[PDB]
Amino acid sequence: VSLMEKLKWKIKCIENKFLNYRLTTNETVVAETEYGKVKGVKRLTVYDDSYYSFEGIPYAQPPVGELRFKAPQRPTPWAGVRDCCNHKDKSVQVDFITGKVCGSEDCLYLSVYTNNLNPETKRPVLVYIHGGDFIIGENHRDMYGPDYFIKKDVVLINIQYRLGALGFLSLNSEDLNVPGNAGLKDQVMALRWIKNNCANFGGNPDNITVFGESAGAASTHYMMLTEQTRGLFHRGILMSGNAICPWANTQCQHRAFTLAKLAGYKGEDNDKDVLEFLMKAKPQDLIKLEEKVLTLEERTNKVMFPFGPTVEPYQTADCVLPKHPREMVKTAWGNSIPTMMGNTSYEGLFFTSILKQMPLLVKELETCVNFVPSELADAERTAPETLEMGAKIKKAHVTGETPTADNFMDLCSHFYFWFPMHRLLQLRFNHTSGTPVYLYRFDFDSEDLINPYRIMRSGRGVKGVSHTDELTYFFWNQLAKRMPKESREYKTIERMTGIWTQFATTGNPYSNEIEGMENVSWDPIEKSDEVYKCLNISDELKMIDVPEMGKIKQWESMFEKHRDLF
Numbered sequence: 001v002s003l004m005e006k007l008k009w010k011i012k013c014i015e016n017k018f019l020n021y022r023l024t025t026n027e028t029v030v031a032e033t034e035y036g037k038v039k040g041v042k043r044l045t046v047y048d049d050s051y052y053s054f055e056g057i058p059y060a061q062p063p064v065g066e067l068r069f070k071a072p073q074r075p076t077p078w079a080g081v082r083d084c085c086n087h088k089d090k091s092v093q094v095d096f097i098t099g100k101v102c103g104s105e106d107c108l109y110l111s112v113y114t115n116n117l118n119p120e121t122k123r124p125v126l127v128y129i130h131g132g133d134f135i136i137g138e139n140h141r142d143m144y145g146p147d148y149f150i151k152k153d154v155v156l157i158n159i160q161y162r163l164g165a166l167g168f169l170s171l172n173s174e175d176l177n178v179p180g181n182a183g184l185k186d187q188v189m190a191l192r193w194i195k196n197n198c199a200n201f202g203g204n205p206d207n208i209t210v211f212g213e214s215a216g217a218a219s220t221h222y223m224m225l226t227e228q229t230r231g232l233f234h235r236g237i238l239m240s241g242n243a244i245c246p247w248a249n250t251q252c253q254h255r256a257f258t259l260a261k262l263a264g265y266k267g268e269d270n271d272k273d274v275l276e277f278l279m280k281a282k283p284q285d286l287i288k289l290e291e292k293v294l295t296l297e298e299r300t301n302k303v304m305f306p307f308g309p310t311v312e313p314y315q316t317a318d319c320v321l322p323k324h325p326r327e328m329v330k331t332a333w334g335n336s337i338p339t340m341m342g343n344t345s346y347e348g349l350f351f352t353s354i355l356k357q358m359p360l361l362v363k364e365l366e367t368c369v370n371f372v373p374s375e376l377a378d379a380e381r382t383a384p385e386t387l388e389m390g391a392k393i394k395k396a397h398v399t400g401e402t403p404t405a406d407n408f409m410d411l412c413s414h415f416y417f418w419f420p421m422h423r424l425l426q427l428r429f430n431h432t433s434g435t436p437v438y439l440y441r442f443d444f445d446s447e448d449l450i451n452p453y454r455i456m457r458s459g460r461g462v463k464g465v466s467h468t469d470e471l472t473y474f475f476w477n478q479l480a481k482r483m484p485k486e487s488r489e490y491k492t493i494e495r496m497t498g499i500w501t502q503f504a505t506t507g508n509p510y511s512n513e514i515e516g517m518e519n520v521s522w523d524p525i526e527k528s529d530e531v532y533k534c535l536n537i538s539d540e541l542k543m544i545d546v547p548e549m550g551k552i553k554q555w556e557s558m559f560e561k562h563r564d565l566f
């Protein structure tokens with residue numbers, strides 16, 4: 001971080017501030033929810049479009065007090081009208097910009113947007129789950145503005161959910177009712193709310209699409225895997241992630257003690273005692289100490305968060321993940337809804353700033369043993385079999401005698417995204433209804449329009465399409481500008497929100513009404529397919545064999561002697 005980027009992020013927080021009231025109209029409106037009436041307000045986009053905005057709709061009790069670390073509870077209804085013209089606070093988290101803890105425990109809200117409260121027809125409902133490694137993110141319009149999607153005749157709903165330890169503490173003791181995955185349970189409860197209330201905003205509750213990017217894609221997939229949500233929605237879109245990514249699940253039941261100890265707990269390792277301590281701690285303290293929880297061994301083995309989705313140690317009424325994600329795929333109801341999956345063309349560029357701070361990471365590619373799937377690798381990663389498996393990875397990404405920064409980030413594309421996509425596609429094909437899955441490859445590179453995560457990746461002036469680079473063409477953010485209607489950037493916004501709304505409506509992403517898609521023939525992946533085909537989205541829209549396929553089969557060959565684990 002810079003002093004520089006702490007300062008003008010705050011003045012474009014000042015410009016957000018002013019422009020949010022400027023682009024507001026004095027036209028307010030009331031809507032029906034099964035919990036009572038809510039009061040929204042009409043807003044304008046910098047494209048002179050307009051939409052109704054309902055923010056701060058609670059779908060659960062504020063998870064404070066004795067409700068902390070607990071499954072979400074249905075909220076208390078209200079007579080009169082609830083104010084929904086201003087956003088609530090985000091989940092407690094460390095500001096990636098300022099390094100300071102922000103947000104509140106009082107964060108279980110969703111936001112509803114639509115350009116027409118009274119449409120003539122029941123509209124497709126799109127529900128977005130933000131990423132942020134399960135430790136940051138929000139549904140504020142400074143990061144996730146609905147301004148592009150409201151050009152289309154859909155209803156868009158952005159949800160929040162508990163993050164970090166507050167969302168994902170897990171204790172083994174049945175007595176304590178902290179089994180884990182509270183934040184996933186937040187998502188469940190918000191989905192249920194959406195099914196039972198979207199009609200009152202003009203949305204068709206029989207045509208609901210859930211989508212998310214990163215941890216948000218892992219989350220979307222989890223919502224497709226769990227029994228808790230069966231039939232609640234009808235399409236799913238997984239943007240750069242899924243539930244069987246190695247990073248998307250962790251056994252964290254031992255780390256609550258560690259967190260307590262970091263926070264000053266005195267006493268023995270006892271779940272009851274640890275929980276009581278954690279229950280009284282200041283929220284901002286737990287969240288800031290979270291970054292010290294992972295051990296050296298865990299960081300080496302590529303654990304990406306201390307507290308995240310987990311296999312719950314016992315079942316409860318609200319249990320979301322009763323088994324390993326791979327096992328859940330076997331009977332997943334979401335296996336049988338139309339699905340779109342995709343990745344950017346240089347995902348791993350995202351890890352630039354991490355790489356910059358920890359340059360020695362590039363030496364991991366000397367043997368690549370640390371990137372071998374942990375289920376295949378030995379503990380110390382010194383076994384000859386592990387060296388052999390690492391050599392397969394090395395041959396896939398190391399271009400010279402010595403690995404470089406870019407070899408590292410190319411490998412990261414596969415470890416984190418492409419290889420888990422391939423494993424999911426294949427696992428799902430062995431247990432699916434035969435409903436279609438479509439692949440996209442987002443390959444549109446621009447420096448003229450960006451989003452705040454570009455700063456995170458320290459990609460202020462790099463070349464390639466990094467993880468999260470596509471969000472820019474879906475959502476308004478406080479760094480966005482009005483772009484010329486003729487610009488390559490404006491044309492991509494229309495294409496992206498176009499394909500996403502087309503898929504949401506029909507379960508098929510192709511429309512000849514989309515500019516650049518005339519010669520496109522977008523078929524889904526078949527079980528018999530040996531090479532994946534994808535819509536490559538660049539300045540042109542082109543159906544191509546996935547370029548990453550060779551490297552994908554190379555990773556797959558690590559499982560030659562262990563096919564049962566693939």
Ligand SMILES: *[B]([O])([O])C1=[C]C(OC2=[C][C]=[C][C]=[C]2)=[C]C(Br)=[C]1
Nearest residue numbers: 131132133214215247304354416
């Ligand atoms: B996605 O936004 O959920 C996402 C984010 C990150 O961010 C991290 C985490 C740890 C170290 C560096 C960057 C990683 C992944 Br994979 C996915």
